[PDB]
Amino acid sequence: NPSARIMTFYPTMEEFRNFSRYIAYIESQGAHRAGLAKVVPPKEWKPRASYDDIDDLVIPAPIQQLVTGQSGLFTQYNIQKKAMTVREFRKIANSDKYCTPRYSEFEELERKYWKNLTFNPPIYGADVNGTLYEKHVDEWNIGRLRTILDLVEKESGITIEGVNTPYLYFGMWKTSFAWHTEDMDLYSINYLHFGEPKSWYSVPPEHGKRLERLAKGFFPGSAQSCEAFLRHKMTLISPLMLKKYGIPFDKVTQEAGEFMITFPYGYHAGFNHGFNCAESTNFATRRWIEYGKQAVLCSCRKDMVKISMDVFVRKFQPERYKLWKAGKDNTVIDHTLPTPEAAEF
Ligand SMILES: CN(c1ccccc1)c1ccc2c(c1)CCC[C@H]2CNc1cnccc1C(=O)O
Ligand code: NI
Ligand SMILES: [Zn+2]
Known part of the structure; x- marks a missing residue:
């Protein structure tokens, strides 16, 4: 995807049943x-x-x-x-x-x-x-996607509403969601159950820093008092501004019956066309772990979501745990790279 444009996929019933595996595929x-x-x-x-x-x-x-x-x-x-x-x-x-x-x-x-x-x-x-x-639907069930994000609840014992549990959203014309990445730069899944469409803007992760620099330049006050002010989810910026300032972005409209997936460090924003209801939660893959270690968190409110990375580093990067605990792990994320579970494709 070297235009890094938003792709659409039409899985068969047989590709669809394994969630993490289909995420692995779309990344291949x-x-x-x-x-x-x-x-x-x-x-x-x-x-x-x-x-x-x-x-x-x-x-x-x-x-x-x-x-x-x-x-x-x-x-x-x-x-x-x-x-x-x-x-x-x-x-x-x-x-x-x-x-x-x-x-x-x-x-x-x-x-x-x-x-x-x-x-x-x-x-x-x-x-x-x-x-x-419904209690019995086994494919792509936002309530139990069964990804490694599940270690937070299962190993750490922590419930975070909307992050490892599902949220519903009732939209009406012109209701909006401001520019942000997910908490901890997680993935998210978004399903439009019924009603009018929801439109989306996205900035490729490989250009996210440009969007932060833009926003910092425009809200210097906001930017001094918090390190990740966009995580407040209060900042809207029109596609004309993005274009004017050379920020690469794409758009897509989500209709009833469709899923949208956002990826780690994928900034997005958007609006609902009319009356609708969406369901969403966060999820992870192996690739996400590094984004979690590196995510830049709201330095200003006592309430914001923070996930302890220890359980993931012990389980999946056991060899780097002390390096990491010792501030000395300094991997650089290449955003172009698929999650390792993509190897089969
Ligand atoms: C401001 N705010 C706040 C956060 C912390 C503490 C005090 C307030 C806050 C937090 C969350 C939200 C909003 C505002 C404004 C409406 C919507 C949701 C975000 N919705 C989406 C996110 N990604 C993708 C899609 C959607 C969507 O609407 O379909
Ligand atoms: Ni979001
Ligand atoms: Zn803050």
């Missing part, structure tokens, strides 16, 4: 270079029979997304509103006040998002704990 195809890949599941697979019995699902902490700024540079402040059900949410989303404007191509809707994101602030039903997968 270079999919990680772009930091984001789409995986369209085989036509007959479905995580759940239907979605008409969730109207009474509670969204404990929904957020109103106030955005402030100009000239394609913005800050998103996420204001916690009272508890509300899926029904109350859908009805707000589908109301004349919040529903999707007229468009006849993505590009038009993109211009409206960037022209209108600081007006009429939407509500996003984000960070809801739960899965919408």
